């Protein structure tokens, strides 16, 4: 189980943060990742962080306005949205996965490179900016 | 307390229903109102039902696409939505209020009309429509 948490509204230029908590602990070769859907759509990856290291990958669309960060403790980590518009409306999957080795943690960034998701958190960010 | 379900994203022109069950049995005065609220707007009267006789009464921006239904069995209600569209986008809140003696159900239009209140659901619209 990949526990989900933190869905809402905001308004375009809003930030919101998401949270995905895992039932079992991480190790050391534990990946994160987030995807999104809106209706009619593909899930489309959005970033991901490598549990050891916390080194983290974006895709182009959310690079340097949203972070990924790892909270050891609750066994969580957070994906923190910035500067959000209308078209990262969607809902959001956190996913984990066990790197393989001779891999790159950054070329996780596919749905099947994923066996493990959780149940998805609606974001909604209206037109109306702040 | 007023639970509610149903929240989720759908398609442009799809159809989806929120549910409300009250804790309490009704009785022939409980009356049930919907209101949605997106952020940058007010919160906004949908539409309510009478227990006592199915009497239902609209927002002028969803009659003819939303059908709210009595659940007797459940103690609850139903707000059917169709033709949706990303103007109805919002998060929809369910309300309860006991009808004072005077005035019609119909009249239970207003957000202080409505001292129970639900917790919210999320609903949106895609821009994206159906392929059928």
């Known amino acids: 189980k990949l526990q989900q948490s933190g869905g809402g509204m905001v308004q375009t230029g809003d930030s919101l943060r998401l949270s995905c908590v895992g039932s079992?602990?991480?190790?050391?070769?534990?990946?994160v990742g987030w995807f999104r859907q809106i209706p009619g759509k593909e899930r489309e990856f959005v970033g991901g962080?490598?549990?050891?290291?916390?080194?983290?990958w974006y895709a182009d669309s959310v690079k340097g306005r949203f972070t990924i960060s790892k909270d050891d403790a609750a066994n969580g980590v957070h994906l923190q949205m910035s500067s959000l518009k209308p078209e990262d409306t969607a809902v959001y999957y956190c996913?984990?996965?066990?790197?393989?080795?001779?891999?790159?943690?950054?070329?996780?960034?596919?749905?099947?490179?994923?066996?493990?998701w959780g149940q998805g958190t609606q974001v909604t960010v209206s037109s109306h900016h702040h | 307390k007023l639970q509610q379900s149903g929240g989720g994203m759908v398609q442009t022109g799809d159809s989806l229903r929120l549910s409300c069950?009250?804790?309490?049995?009704?009785?022939?005065?409980?009356?049930?109102?919907?209101f949605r609220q997106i952020p940058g707007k007010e919160r906004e009267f949908?539409?309510?039902?009478?227990?006592?006789?199915?009497?239902?009464?609209?927002?002028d921006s969803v009659k003819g696409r939303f059908t709210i239904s009595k659940d007797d069995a459940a103690n609850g209600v139903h707000l059917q939505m169709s033709s949706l569209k990303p103007e109805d986008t919002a998060v929809?809140?369910?309300?309860?209020?006991?009808?004072?003696?005077?005035?019609?159900?119909?009249?239970?239009?207003?957000?202080?009309?409505?001292?129970?209140?639900?917790?919210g659901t999320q609903v949106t619209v895609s821009s994206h429509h159906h392929h059928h």
């Open positions: 996913a984990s996965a066990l790197r393989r080795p001779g891999s790159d943690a950054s070329d996780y960034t596919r749905i099947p490179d994923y066996p493990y």
């Open positions: 962080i490598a549990w050891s290291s916390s080194d983290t």
């Open positions: 079992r602990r991480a190790l050391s070769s534990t990946i």
